Design a protein around this nucleic acid. Structure first.
Ligand SMILES: *CCOCCOCCS*
Ligand SMILES: [Mg+2]
Ligand SMILES: [Mg+2]
Ligand SMILES: [Mg+2]
Ligand SMILES: [Mg+2]
Length: 313
DNA sequence: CAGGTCT
DNA sequence: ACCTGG
C-alpha cells in the first residue's frame, strides 16, 4: 500500500485535485504524444514522471485533475506544488477559447477538433527539450524514448525509486558537457547523436553564456530565439521550432515536416506560390509555416498539435 | 531514396 | 554538400 506507484483508489488521502475539465486537458493525448519522452502510464489511466524536480503520478476524472507527489512523511501536494502542475500544463491557456477561434477561421479544424479535445502544449524545460529533440534526428518515437531514458539514467541525479523504476532528473549542462560523455552515450545506443549532445552541452556552457543564455530566449522574440538555437550542433530549423514551441514560450512556432506537408496538401490544397521549388525545401517550409501562422494566429503551433493528435489514429 | 542538418 | 533508418 505504502510502497510502489500510487493510484487514486489505493491511497486516496495522498491525492489533491486541480479543477480542470477533460476538454481542457486529455493526459492520454498530451503525455505520450512525443512532446515529453519521460511520462509513463505505469497503472491504467495513471501517468508518472518528473515535474519540478520531484516525481508525480497524475490521473483525471471528468472535472478534476488528480495529483500526488513523492517527496519524508507522505502527504498531499501543497498549494504551491499544485501550481507547478498548472504551470507545466499552462492551464490559464483555455482551450475552449482557442478551439473556438481556430474553428471560426478554419472549418476543417472545426470538423476535426471536436473528436480531439484537450490537446495542449506542455511548458517543458529548455535543456530537457533541446537534448531530447537532438536525439530525435533520423529517429522514431519508440527508440527516442529509450535513448532519453538511458541518457537520464546514466547522467541525471537519482530522485527516488518506486517499484523497480528509479526516477532520474534530466542531466545538467555540466554533466552532458563532461569528459567521455560521447563515448558513454554511444555505448547507450545514441550513435552519432552522442557527439551532438556533447558538442551542444559544451557550446552552450563554454561559448554562449550557459544556462542563462538559453533561459533568457524565453524573453526574446521567436525570430531571435530560433536564430540563436540554430547555431547549436544537432539543431536545425525543425528542431529549433520544436524547442521554441515546447520550451521557450513561442506558441506561434509551426515546426514544418513532411507530416505537415501531408496535412497542408490533403486538407487545405496548399501549394507553394512565392517559392520556386514544388516539394519540401528551406524556402518552401518557411512559406508553409507562415501560411498556418496567418490562418491560425499567434497560437498556430497549438493548433497543429490538435491536427497532429487527430491524424494519429 | 526519405527527410533532417551543416557550411 | 553531409548524415542514418525503411
Ligand atoms: C543530417 C546531418 O546530421 C548532422 C549531424 O552531424 C554530426 C554531428 S552530431
Ligand atoms: Mg522533451
Ligand atoms: Mg561532453
Ligand atoms: Mg545547428
Ligand atoms: Mg491563434
Amino acid at each position: 500500500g505504502s510502497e510502489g506507484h500510487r493510484t487514486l483508489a489505493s491511497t486516496p488521502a495522498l491525492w489533491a485535485s486541480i479543477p480542470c475539465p477533460r476538454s481542457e486537458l486529455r493526459l492520454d493525448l498530451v503525455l505520450p504524444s512525443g512532446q515529453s519522452f519521460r511520462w509513463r502510464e505505469q497503472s491504467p489511466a495513471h501517468w508518472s514522471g518528473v515535474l519540478a524536480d520531484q516525481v508525480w503520478t497524475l490521473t483525471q476524472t471528468e472535472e478534476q485533475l488528480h495529483c500526488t507527489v513523492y517527496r519524508s512523511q507522505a502527504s498531499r501536494p501543497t498549494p504551491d506544488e499544485l501550481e507547478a502542475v498548472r504551470k507545466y500544463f499552462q492551464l490559464d491557456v483555455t482551450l475552449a477559447q482557442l478551439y473556438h477561434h481556430w474553428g471560426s477561421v478554419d472549418s476543417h479544424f472545426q470538423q476535426v477538433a471536436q473528436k480531439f479535445q484537450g490537446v495542449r502544449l506542455l511548458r517543458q524545460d529548455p535543456i530537457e527539450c533541446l537534448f531530447s529533440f537532438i536525439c530525435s534526428s533520423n529517429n522514431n518515437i519508440a527508440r527516442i524514448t529509450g535513448m532519453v531514458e538511458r541518457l537520464c539514467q546514466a547522467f541525471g541525479p537519482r530522485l527516488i525509486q518506486l517499484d523497480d523504476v528509479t526516477y532520474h532528473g534530466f542531466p545538467s549542462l555540466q554533466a552532458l558537457a563532461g569528459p567521455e560523455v560521447e563515448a558513454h552515450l554511444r555505448k547507450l545506443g545514441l550513435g552519432y547523436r552522442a557527439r551532438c549532445v556533447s558538442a551542444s552541452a559544451r557550446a552552450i556552457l563554454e561559448e554562449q553564456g550557459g544556462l542563462a543564455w538559453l533561459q533568457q530566449l524565453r524573453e526574446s522574440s521567436y525570430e531571435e530565439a530560433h536564430k540563436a538555437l540554430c547555431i547549436l550542433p544537432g539543431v536545425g530549423t525543425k528542431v529549433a521550432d520544436w524547442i521554441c514551441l515546447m520550451a521557450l514560450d513561442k506558441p506561434q512556432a509551426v515546426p514544418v515536416d513532411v507530416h505537415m506537408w501531408h496535412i497542408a496538401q490533403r486538407d487545405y490544397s496548399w501549394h507553394p506560390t512565392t517559392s520556386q521549388a514544388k516539394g519540401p525545401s528551406p524556402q518552401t517550409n518557411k512559406e508553409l509555416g507562415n501560411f498556418f501562422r496567418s490562418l491560425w494566429g499567434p497560437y498556430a503551433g497549438w493548433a497543429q498539435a490538435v491536427l497532429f493528435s487527430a491524424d494519429l489514429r
